């Protein structure tokens, strides 16, 4: 039922999108003369649109100059029944190359008719067949809240060859949520952010299979969703521990010169620091100009966080946070 971590390939699945996107290339180039008048076939197709590299859907802000006139020249049945016969007459010769199911696969979905059949319902390999077994039992004890049994599902899912980056850290709470005799959860994310974290560039021209840039990558211009998770975690673990300066070096050590979200948590390393240092057991030389570093640090790191892209911080409220410590300091 769930999503499965297999890089699976079969010839009929490699055909049925080459049988699909090739016809899309024609009907769009057929559209290129109709909209004007009044060797992979997928690599050629993706040179028009941007893979989002940060999200499942490349969102676009509507409150901008992104307006557009509305085309009130409708596409009726006349202009559509005449535009489609010339690629479909041409498409018959790769149909006699593909199998007898794919001629019925393409021509049924050519008039609507989204298929029902699962692409992972016929994998049949006795081990991939045991992957889909223990990835639908993995969630099913998570969603029923049974960890010390789902711990043993996941200890035997990692050891099967073929499992991906996905399920490794997505349900990595099983060490975290255990806490009985567990490894406290954070040690696994340290393992994660070392060896899968790259600084590669998103080449966008290869057609991607079984790795996906929303969650499981770590390249440039998309911080790793398990790395910022590791950044937000250990500071809450720092917040739970009342060492603070270790991550305040470990964010200081990378100059992530792309985003805004790393700066606020880097600013939050000083904001969390400056609370207990603004206690002093009051009711006097070192511990007055000591906090005034960290008071000064956040006003810089948030200022450069706000210089970056869309990341709406409470720019009114955060100044009023540390200003309360100046009254404690005075």
């Amino acid at each position: 039922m769930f999503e499965v971590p297999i890089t699976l390939t079969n010839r009929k699945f490699a055909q049925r999108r080459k049988l699909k996107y090739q016809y899309i290339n024609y009907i769009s180039r057929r559209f290129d003369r109709i909209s004007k008048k009044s060797s992979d076939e997928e690599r050629k197709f993706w040179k028009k649109y941007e893979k989002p590299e940060k999200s499942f859907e490349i969102w676009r802000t509507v409150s901008s100059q992104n307006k557009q006139p509305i085309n009130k020249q409708k596409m009726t049945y006349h202009n559509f029944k005449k535009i489609e016969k010339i690629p479909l007459r041409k498409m018959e010769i790769p149909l006699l190359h593909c199998t007898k199911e794919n001629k019925l696969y393409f021509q049924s979905i050519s008039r609507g008719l989204e298929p029902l059949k699962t692409s992972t319902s016929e994998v049949r390999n006795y081990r991939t067949r045991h992957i889909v077994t223990l990835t639908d039992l993995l969630h099913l004890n998570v969603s029923r809240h049974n960890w010390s049994l789902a711990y043993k599902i996941f200890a035997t899912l990692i050891r099967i060859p073929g499992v991906q980056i996905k399920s490794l850290w997505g349900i990595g709470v099983e060490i975290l949520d255990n806490l009985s005799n567990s490894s406290s959860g954070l040690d696994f994310l340290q393992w994660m952010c070392q060896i899968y974290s790259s600084k590669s560039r998103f080449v966008q021209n290869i057609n991607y299979r079984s790795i996906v840039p929303p969650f499981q990558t770590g390249s440039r211009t998309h911080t790793a969703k398990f790395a910022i998770t590791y950044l937000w975690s250990s500071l809450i673990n720092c917040q739970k521990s009342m060492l603070i300066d270790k991550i305040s070096e470990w964010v200081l050590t990378p100059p992530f010169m792309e985003d805004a979200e790393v700066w606020f948590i880097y600013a939050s390393c000083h904001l969390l620091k400056a609370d207990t240092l603004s206690r002093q057991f009051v009711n006097r030389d070192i511990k007055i100009n000591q906090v005034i570093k960290h008071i000064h640090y956040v006003r810089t790191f948030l200022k450069i966080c706000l210089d970056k892209g869309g990341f709406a911080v409470p720019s009114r409220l955060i100044e009023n946070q540390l200003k309360s410590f100046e009254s404690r300091l005075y």
Binding site: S148, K152, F188, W191
Partner: peptide, 16 residues
């Protein structure tokens, strides 16, 4: 040895 490092945090037996 990265894979060796992986199963130091997932021992196949129960932790206790």
């Amino acid at each position: 040895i990265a894979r060796r490092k992986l199963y130091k945090i997932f021992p196949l037996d129960r932790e206790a």
